Amino acid sequence: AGRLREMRCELSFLKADGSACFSQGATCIWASCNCIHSTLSNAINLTVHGIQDDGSMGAVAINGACFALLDNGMPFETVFCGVLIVRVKDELIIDPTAKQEAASTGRVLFSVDGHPEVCAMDAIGHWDFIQLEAAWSLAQPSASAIFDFYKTVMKRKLSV
Amino acid sequence: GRLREMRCELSFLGSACFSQGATCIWASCSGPGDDISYRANCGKFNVLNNIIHSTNAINLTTISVTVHGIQDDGSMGAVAINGACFALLDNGMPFETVFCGVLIVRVKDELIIDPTAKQEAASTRVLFSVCKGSDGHPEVCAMDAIGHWDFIQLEAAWSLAQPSASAIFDFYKTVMKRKLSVD
């Protein structure tokens, strides 16, 4: 099976409360609070930019939304990943790149009780259900990995 | 539960305005072309994603698709796309890349397909969107599952979304045959 895109993220240095820069996976974008059902998860309660794209449509444009507010008085109970997995040809590659257009179908990005499992998702392509299940597993595990980074990025900012 | 009455005219002015029994929309479009977001209103991220259900073959582009529905008896997604298929049917993009789609939702145990204002509310929500294609089949083109299902509550969702879908397709034929005679 494929794997996670390499992850990294610088934090704010601006003068809003929600702030950061999700510079990860060759697709470094910054957010704060073109180069929502996904964005909302758990209230209470209840604004992002992409500097460059060569990979994850949502994974980056979604994770970047969490950091900012996680580092913003808002608790960590409401965390979300949320990985995207593009099913290509046979088997499954994890995360995208320029190897994304050949996604065929492809394009299942679960916007993933904040311990393991799913909260939401989306599928796009002329494909059966036998496949989506292969994404019920392996996907959220990689998802677990990023929640750990989460903690770790937010393991340096609280104590610097 | 299941599908419902269907009110679809083309005399609105190309113009169409679908209406699944309790729900209803009033759409529009363009051929050549050269807040609460979209799809739609009642009485910073993405692009109101559902527009992807709209997008062998393209055009078939500077194409408009002003759609609205004051009679939003829940099921806004399904109707907002069902009628979005007739709007340009006046322009007459032949049976090929038309579409539905049905938004069956999960309620406690077992299933109810085409909900209500009250039913669709206390739901705890898939939105099967799909286009026939090569042969009779629908060939699922999209879904927007939310909550907790996976296979068990989806393997039996592709099912209903099938018969009640091949059925609705026919109504499109029933509407084409309508004015393919009167004019």
CATH number at residue A74: 3.30.230.70
Give chain B's domain count.
1
By Cβ distance, the residue of A47, A65, A123 closest to B143 is A123
Chain A residues inside the 8 Å CB shell of B139? 126
Resolution in Å equals 3.9
Hey, what are B65's tokens? 């698709």
Cβ within 8 Å, pair B139-A132: no
CA distances from residue B161 to A12, A32, B112, B132, B169 in whole angstroms, order as listed? 47, 40, 11, 13, 12
Burial, B73: exposed, middle or buried (Cβ in 10 Å; 0-12, 13-18, 19+)? buried
Q: Is the dihedral of CA B81, B83, B87, B92 positive or negative?
A: positive
Distance CA A78, CA A45 (A): 10
Instruction: For residue B17, give the nearest of B91, B72, B69 by alpha carbon.
Output: B69
Residue B51: count other Cβ atoms within 10 Å of its Cβ: 15
Hey, what are B35's tokens? 């807040």
> Cα-Cα-Cα-Cα dihedral of B109, B112, B113, B118, to 10°?
-120
Range of the domain at A123: 1-160
Which SS3 state, helix, strand or coil, does residue B115 take?
A: coil
Structural method = X-ray
Under a CB-based contact definition with an 8 Å cutoff, are residues B100 and B141 in contact? no
Instruction: For residue A10, give the nearest of A69, A67, A92 by alpha carbon.
Output: A67
Could you identify the residue written with the tokens 């009485």?
B43
The secondary element (H helix, E strand) that includes residue B174 is helix B163-182
The minimum CA-CA distance between B148 and chain A, rounded to whole Å, is 7
Chain B residues inside the 8 Å CB shell of A131? none
Mutate to test the interface with B, among A32, A60, A118, A136 (most CBs of B within 10 A): A118
Q: Indicate the DSSP class of residue B114.
A: S
Q: Is B86 left (phi over 0), alpha (psi -120 to 50) or beta?
A: alpha
For chain A, the residue count is: 160
Instruction: For residue A56, give the nearest of A119, A21, A100, A88 by alpha carbon.
Output: A100
A134 touches chain B (CB under 8 A): no
Chain B residues inside the 8 Å CB shell of A127? 140
Under a CB-based contact definition with an 8 Å cutoff, are residues A63 and A22 in contact? yes
Q: Is the dihedral of CA B57, B60, B66, B72 positive or negative?
A: negative
> Cα-Cα-Cα-Cα dihedral of B74, B77, B82, B83, to 10°?
80
The secondary element (H helix, E strand) that includes residue B142 is strand B140-143
Distance CA B132, CA A119 (A): 30
| B144, closest residue in chain A (CA to CA) | A122
Hey, what are B24's tokens? 């209803």
For chain B, the residue count is: 183
Cβ within 8 Å, pair A124-B133: no
Chain A residues inside the 8 Å CB shell of B141? 124-126
Under a CB-based contact definition with an 8 Å cutoff, are residues A94 and A70 in contact? no
Under a CB-based contact definition with an 8 Å cutoff, are residues A59 and A82 in contact? yes
**Omega before residue B57 within 30° of 0, cis:** yes
Distance CA A153, CA A29 (A): 16
Chain B residues inside the 8 Å CB shell of A125? 141-142
B156 touches chain A (CB under 8 A): no
Q: For Cα atoms B86, B89, B92, give the angle at the middle one, nearest 5 degrees.
A: 175
Q: What pairs with residue B148 in β-bridges?
A: none
Q: What pairs with residue A120 in β-bridges?
A: B146
By Cβ distance, the residue of A38, A118, A123 closest to B142 is A123
Pairing status of strand B105-106 against strand B68-71: unpaired
